[PDB]
Amino acid sequence: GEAPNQALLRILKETEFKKIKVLGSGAFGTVYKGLWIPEGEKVKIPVAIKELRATSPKANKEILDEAYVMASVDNPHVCRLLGICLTSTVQLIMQLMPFGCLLDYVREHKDNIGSQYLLNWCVQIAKGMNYLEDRRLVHRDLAARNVLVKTPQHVKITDFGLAKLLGAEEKEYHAEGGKVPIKWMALESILHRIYTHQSDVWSYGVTVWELMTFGSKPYDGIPASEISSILEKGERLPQPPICTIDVYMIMVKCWMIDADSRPKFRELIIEFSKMARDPQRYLVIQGDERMHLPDMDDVVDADEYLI
Ligand SMILES: */C=C/C(=O)Nc1cccc(Nc2nc(Nc3ccc(N4CCN(C(C)=O)CC4)cc3OC)ncc2C(F)(F)F)c1
């Protein structure tokens, strides 16, 4: 029942790209801002380069798994892997997203973020997630931190590090114990290590909550061990001040105990899209009207660089 995965994995010469400056640091890897020039193509492509420290064979296995997933996705609302460089250190080359992660963007820019941007971001994430479902991909780590901003107008889902691809036959994926973001997790996943597209939907609800609260941490001041019981009791994240009941009810649905009664991503696209048509009706934000948000000769965005 499973179709062949015919995605190309592109191997890139080290010489083809130059790191310009560091973006983020981890012992495991450091992401770099960079320029990519395909050999003799006359284009420059802004990129983010993730290269691992001097690191374990296991570390190299995980990075390759990430590369496999990223190579296999092509959607406007998903980040895609441009290629990999097989140096002494393995490097993932990705499209640069100039405005960084969405979680940082909302926190930084709250005073200038209108209802239209929020509702639109919600539609875009739903579109990306729906695409992943079409691809039978369960992301397993959806969060504001894992959404990137190409422009304030355009966002893409990222971080396929925990991402798992379902067999056509099998709905659910059962996970060996590993470090997890409980606060974004569905209850069934927390209790049983069970992940589904519907479980992704619970995560989406939390992500929406994060955007509506302009980057607040969910269940702040509460230990992860506690969270499972709290949900069991029936506690849920509080309605955000900007949110109307219409928006909030959607989040609540995402957090329902019965996974099937939760909304489909395709539905989420429809509902948010209607709201986006008249944003002030569904999100109440002070001063909504006033706010506005944002050799290079041969530079081309990755989205415009095809094969
Ligand atoms: C939610 C935090 C987060 O994801 N941070 C982060 C940091 C570094 C790389 C990535 N991944 C990434 N980023 C970008 N584009 C991008 C990200 C961050 C920044 N910053 C971060 C803060 N800065 C400083 C100096 O502290 C500068 C601006 C800038 C930037 O582009 C300019 N593009 C792609 C990735 C990818 F994920 F690796 F692909 C995330």
Residue numbers in the entry: 696 to 748, 750 to 990, 1006 to 1018
Task: Please quote the authors directly.
We therefore determined the complex crystal structures of EGFR T790M/CO-1686 and EGFR L858R/CO-1686. The binding modes of CO-1686 to EGFR T790M and L858R are essentially the same and EGFR mutant proteins adopt the “DFG-in/C-helix in” active conformation. As expected, CO-1686 covalently binds to EGFR through Cys797 in both structures. In the T790M/CO-1686 and L858R/CO-1686 complex crystal structures, the anilinopyrimidine core of CO-1686 form two hydrogen bonds with Met793 amide and carbonyl in the hinge of the kinase. In the structure of T790M/CO-1686, the trifluoromethyl (−CF3) substituent attached to the pyrimidine ring contacts the mutant gatekeeper residue Met790 by hydrophobic interaction, which may be the only difference between the T790M/CO-1686 and L858R/CO-1686 structures. The hydrophobicity afforded by the T790M gatekeeper mutation is beneficial to the potency of this drug towards EGFR. In the T790M/CO-1686 complex structure, the anilinopyrimidine scaffold of CO-1686 fits well to the methionine gatekeeper. The hydrophobic interaction between the trifluoromethyl moiety and the Met790 side-chain enhances the affinity of CO-1686 towards T790M. Probably because the trifluoromethyl substituent on the pyrimidine ring contacting the mutant gatekeeper residue Met790 is much bulkier than the chlorine substituent in WZ4002, the CO-1686 core scaffold is “pushed out” a bit compared to WZ4002, and the distance of the bidentate hydrogen bonds between the anilinopyrimidine core and the ‘hinge’ residue Met793 are closer in the T790M/CO-1686 structure than those observed in the T790M/WZ4002 structure. What’s more, the C-helix in T790M/CO-1686 structure rotates about 20° inwards when compared with the T790M/WZ4002 complex.
